[PDB]
Amino acid sequence: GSMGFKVKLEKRRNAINTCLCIGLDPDEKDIENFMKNEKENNYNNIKKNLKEKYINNVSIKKDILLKAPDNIIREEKSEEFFYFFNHFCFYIINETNKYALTFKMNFAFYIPYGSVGIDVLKNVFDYLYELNIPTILDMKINDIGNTVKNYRKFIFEYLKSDSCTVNIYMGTNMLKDICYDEEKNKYYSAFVLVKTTNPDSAIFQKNLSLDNKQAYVIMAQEALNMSSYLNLEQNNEFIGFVVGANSYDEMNYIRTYFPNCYILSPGIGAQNGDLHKTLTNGYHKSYEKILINIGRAITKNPYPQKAAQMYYDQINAILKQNM
């Protein structure tokens, strides 16, 4: 893993020929359903997880993770939730990774049980790192410089994430303490929020303006200005933009006015975005520049390998059309 995110994404894209970003946002029902299904089926999927060589290379509680499932429930009741949570994530990754340009894990899904889910998240990032699959930590972080450097450490040193999401409403100077580490002279990549998928996203992103430009345009320009100041792209890193898969006019504007920007686009599947429109409006011939994120539509499907294949094939068909 000795290459910048820009180069890592380019190589993978060249290898697997897609821009599918698979979202791994397991909720409590997903974990419970997994536990239930595995008990009913002789734990087939966990046994398959246990086969995989890199499972021996994760950091946290291997002594538990590598135990036989029927042992967990019988002798390790307190470690049960950790075990089934972690094995669910490993299962999704094992089934879908061959279709994924990148995986994006949203931090919110890993925190609500306290420390246990952060052990899971750490093992998920360790695992993806070993598989050499590009990663995004979706955490829409924001704070003053002194405070955000703690997120930089968590995300880029502890998890060894390739990138993260950031909300720059507080200002762009925070990026100096996220995309750059002055002590180590390391650079990192991020996606800043530009236009989001929530139904009332226009209220600030579009209604606020300076002169005749809407906030989302100003914010995108300011992010880019900070990327140039930081020399990110000279260091094979970048600041890109989050633009929702339902925001078809904004996607078109962003791609038109910032031709070579990297775009991360959530909102397909569960949130009902239009894939043809989104992919067409954000298209770049280096299509790692238009990451299409699909979470629940893959992870909540009874056969996530087949779900990921469907989206992979659907995307590639639209990619072929754009040519």
Ligand X SMILES: *c1cc(=O)[nH]c(=O)n1[C@@H]1O[C@H](COP(=O)(O)O)[C@@H](O)[C@H]1O
Rounded to the nearest whole angstrom, what is the least distance from the CB of residue 242 to ligand X in the complex? 5
Spatial neighbors of 165 by CB under 8 A, at least 6 apart, are: 136, 137, 138, 139, 140, 141, 190, 191, 192, 193, 242, 264
Q: How far apart are CA 26 and CA 108, in angstroms?
A: 10
Amino acid type, 241: F
Which residues in the 84-113 window bind ligand X by CB under 6 A?
106
Q: How far apart are CA 254 and CA 205, in angstroms?
A: 13
Q: Residue 8 corresponds to which tokens in the numbers above?
A: 């890592």
Residue 294 interacts with, from its own copies, ligand X, none (CB under 5-8 Å by kind): ligand X
Which residues in the 268-297 window bind its own copies by CB under 8 A?
270-271
Dihedral sign of CA atoms 249, 251, 254, 257 in order? negative
Residues known to be catalytic: 140
Q: How far apart are CA 102 and CA 216, in angstroms?
A: 25
Which residues in the 46-65 window bind its own copies by CB under 8 A?
60
Stretch that binds its own copies, among 30-38, 97-105, 134-142, 252-260 (CB under 8 A): 134-142
Q: How far apart are CA 218 and CA 211, in angstroms?
A: 10
**Neighbouring C-beta atoms of residue 16, cutoff 10 Å:** 17
Told to check if 295 binds ligand X by CB under 6 A, we report yes
Told to check if 69 binds ligand X by CB under 6 A, we report no
Residues 208-227: x/- map of binding to its own copies (CB under 8 A)? xxx----x--xx--x-----
Q: Which of 45, 197, 278, 299 binds its own copies (CB under 8 A)?
A: 197
Closest to its own copies by CB, 38 or 79: 79
Q: Which of 144, 203, 208, 317 binds ligand X (CB under 6 A)?
A: 144
Rounded to the nearest whole angstrom, what is the least distance from the CB of residue 309 to ligand X in the complex? 17
Q: How far apart are CA 137 and CA 125, in angstroms?
A: 9
Which residues in the 193-212 window bind ligand X by CB under 6 A?
196-197
For residue 275, report the phi and psi dihedrals to the nearest 5 degrees.
Answer: -70, -45
Which residues contribute to the site for ligand X (CB under 6 A)?
A: 23, 25, 106, 138, 143-144, 147, 196-197, 242, 244, 266-267, 269-271, 293-297
* Residue list for the binding site for UMP: 25, 104, 106, 138, 140, 143, 147, 197, 271, 295-296
